[PDB]
Amino acid sequence: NIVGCRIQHGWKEGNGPVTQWKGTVLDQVPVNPSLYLIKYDGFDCVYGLELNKDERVSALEVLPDADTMIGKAVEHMEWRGMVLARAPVMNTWFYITYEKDPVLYMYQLLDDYKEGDLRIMVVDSLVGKQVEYAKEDGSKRTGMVIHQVEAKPSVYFIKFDDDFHIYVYDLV
Amino acid sequence: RRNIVGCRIQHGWKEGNGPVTQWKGTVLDQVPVNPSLYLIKYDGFDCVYGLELNKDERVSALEVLPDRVATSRISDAHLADTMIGKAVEHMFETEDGSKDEWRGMVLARAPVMNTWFYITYEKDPVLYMYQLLDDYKEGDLRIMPDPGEVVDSLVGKQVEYAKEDGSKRTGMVIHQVEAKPSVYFIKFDDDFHIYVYDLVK
C-alpha cells in the first residue's frame, strides 16, 4: 500500500501536454484495492484513481513525508454543505461536500473556523455494492459504493465508472 | 521588495557579447506561483513578456520611470465586457499591402492598462495585447459565434510536451483564464513569450 505516502506522476489525456501532479495518498479502498483516494497539491477535490491501471497516469513515483462539526450542516465562506469526517493521513484536513456540488472536498476547516468562516448551524451498510442512477436520456450511470459516513451512516461515498471525483450521496 | 506591479520601467537588455538595447514597458503582473517572474507589456512589442527581471542577468540597470496614467472607466464598456471569452477574426495589414485575417480568442481585459485586452490566436498561441476597441471601430475585429472526467485548476503545475525533434519543452502553468477555465497561460523555460493553451482537453 502507498497509503500515507507521497506521489508524483504525469497526467496525460489526449495528445496533450503532460501536467505534473503531486499529492499524498490517503486511502486504498477495501472494496476495490486498485483504487486509491488522493489529495493533490492545488486541488480542492479528493481524487479516486486506479493509479496502476489508469493510462492517464504517467511514470508514477513515491516521495518523502473537530469532533464537534463532524456530521453537522454548515455554511462557510457563501456555500452550504456538510462536514463528513477528518481526512485520513492528513489529520488536520476535513472531508466536506456541498449541496450545490455533492462531491468530496478536503479543507483545513479549523483554520476557516478561526477566521470565523464557519457557521455550524433500514438497510445496513451498502459499501461494496454497485449502484445505478438513471439520468437525463434514459441511460444508466453506474458506480460503486466505497464508504459510509460514520457520523451520518445514511450518507455514502460513491466512485462512478466515468469520473475520478468521489460523489457523496444520501441513499435513504 | 519594491512593488513594481503597475509601474513604468526601463532596463538594458544584453544577450551574449551583443550590444545593450534599452527596453521600456509597463509591469502588468507578478506571478503568484513564481514571484520572481513578471509579465510586462513593452513599448514596441505586441506580445506580453514574462521575465524574472531581478534575477535574469540579461536585464541590467532596472529602473522605475515616472508613473503612467490609466483610464478609469473605458467607453463602450458593454462591448468590452461582451468581447471577453469570444472567438474572433482579427484583420491585420501585411507586406506592403492587403489584409491578413487571424482567428483567435479574446481572453480578458489586461491588468493595469485598462483600454487593452489579452488575446491569443489559433495560428500563434501566445499572449498578445491590443486596444481592441480601436480595431473593432475600424472594422478589423469581428466577433464570432462560439465534464465527465474533467479537472480542477492546473495553476502552479509543471508541464512538459514532446517537440518534433524528441526533446522536451518544460514549463509551468501560471494563470487560469477566468472567462474560459479550461484555458491556461504557460511560461515555458525556453521562451519569454506566454503561451495560451486549453488544458482540459
Side-chain angles (χ1 to χ4, degrees):
Chain A
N1 55 35
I2 308 157
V3 176
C5 291
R6 258 238 134 179
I7 65 134
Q8 190 188 332
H9 65 80
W11 179 254
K12 178 188 155 306
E13 60 188 332
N15 32 262
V18 191
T19 47
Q20 197 75 29
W21 294 17
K22 292 179 148 300
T24 96
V25 177
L26 331 156
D27 208 307
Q28 175 171 27
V29 186
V31 301
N32 186 174
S34 64
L35 172 66
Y36 305 73
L37 293 197
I38 309 110
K39 170 65 181 74
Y40 290 104
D41 298 335
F43 288 176
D44 286 331
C45 294
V46 168
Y47 273 46
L49 296 170
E50 301 204 300
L51 291 174
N52 309 111
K53 294 74 174 175
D54 206 306
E55 69 176 350
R56 283 177 297 187
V57 179
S58 335
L60 177 79
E61 309 189 339
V62 179
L63 248 81
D65 274 38
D67 315 297
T68 132
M69 17 148 109
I70 289 182
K72 288 169 173 57
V74 175
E75 285 276 16
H76 98 143
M77 286 142 180
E78 67 139 72
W79 298 97
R80 170 212 158 99
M82 177 192 333
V83 172
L84 308 156
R86 213 165 188 154
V89 168
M90 283 135 101
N91 283 293
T92 327
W93 300 77
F94 280 73
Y95 277 168
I96 185 167
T97 188
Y98 304 96
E99 331 288 18
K100 280 288 203 255
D101 202 23
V103 164
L104 187 63
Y105 289 80
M106 183 160 30
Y107 290 129
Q108 260 160 155
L109 282 186
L110 300 175
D111 299 17
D112 292 36
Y113 194 78
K114 64 73 198 294
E115 195 199 357
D117 294 302
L118 270 7
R119 305 283 161 187
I120 307 204
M121 351 243 106
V122 224
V123 183
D124 301 300
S125 188
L126 298 166
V127 172
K129 285 171 175 57
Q130 159 176 302
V131 60
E132 301 207 349
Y133 277 85
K135 196 178 274 275
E136 302 178 47
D137 21 44
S139 73
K140 330 201 156 163
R141 174 170 208 199
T142 149
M144 170 61 60
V145 185
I146 64 171
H147 281 311
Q148 171 176 46
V149 177
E150 181 168 295
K152 189 158 109 174
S154 187
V155 177
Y156 298 81
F157 283 4
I158 290 157
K159 169 75 177 71
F160 279 111
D161 291 330
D162 64 16
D163 196 25
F164 37 59
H165 294 84
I166 300 308
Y167 297 73
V168 179
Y169 296 166
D170 189 304
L171 313 181
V172 176
Chain B
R1 173 44 162 323
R2 154 137 213 190
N3 182 192
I4 58 177
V5 175
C7 296
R8 276 284 295 175
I9 59 169
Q10 71 171 1
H11 63 79
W13 175 258
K14 175 180 168 54
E15 292 191 274
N17 280 171
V20 180
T21 45
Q22 184 182 59
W23 291 22
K24 286 181 170 182
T26 298
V27 179
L28 315 167
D29 187 34
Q30 182 170 4
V31 184
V33 295
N34 184 182
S36 301
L37 180 66
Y38 296 86
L39 296 196
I40 310 104
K41 173 60 179 64
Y42 284 109
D43 299 356
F45 295 165
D46 293 332
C47 297
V48 167
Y49 270 45
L51 289 178
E52 295 191 347
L53 300 162
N54 306 292
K55 300 184 186 177
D56 197 317
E57 62 180 27
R58 287 171 299 184
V59 176
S60 63
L62 190 52
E63 311 183 340
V64 288
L65 291 168
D67 286 328
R68 66 181 307 274
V69 181
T71 302
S72 183
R73 310 248 74 211
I74 197 173
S75 54
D76 277 304
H78 287 280
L79 166 63
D81 290 4
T82 292
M83 276 171 70
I84 308 304
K86 296 294 192 299
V88 300
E89 307 218 89
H90 207 347
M91 189 81 69
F92 281 91
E93 267 183 11
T94 352
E95 321 274 291
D96 191 276
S98 77
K99 337 272 130 161
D100 190 8
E101 186 174 61
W102 280 21
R103 178 81 175 204
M105 184 192 301
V106 179
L107 312 158
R109 186 82 67 88
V112 187
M113 301 173 62
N114 209 208
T115 64
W116 296 70
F117 297 72
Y118 277 165
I119 177 174
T120 186
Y121 307 89
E122 69 170 16
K123 304 165 199 74
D124 193 356
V126 296
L127 185 56
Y128 282 77
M129 248 175 94
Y130 293 110
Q131 295 178 286
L132 295 180
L133 295 185
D134 293 357
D135 301 66
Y136 187 90
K137 293 166 178 143
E138 294 188 46
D140 295 327
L141 188 74
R142 286 150 46 220
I143 296 170
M144 305 289 114
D146 334 298
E149 300 274 40
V150 153
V151 208
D152 288 40
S153 176
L154 300 172
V155 174
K157 283 179 170 50
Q158 296 209 344
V159 302
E160 76 175 51
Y161 83 70
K163 290 168 57 173
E164 206 79 35
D165 63 23
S167 68
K168 301 189 172 176
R169 284 195 84 183
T170 49
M172 169 163 59
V173 178
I174 62 165
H175 274 311
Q176 178 182 63
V177 182
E178 274 196 45
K180 248 212 115 167
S182 72
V183 184
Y184 294 83
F185 282 11
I186 287 167
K187 172 63 172 65
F188 281 103
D189 300 324
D190 62 1
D191 197 332
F192 9 66
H193 283 93
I194 302 302
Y195 287 67
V196 190
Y197 296 146
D198 182 314
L199 293 180
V200 178
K201 184 56 179 139

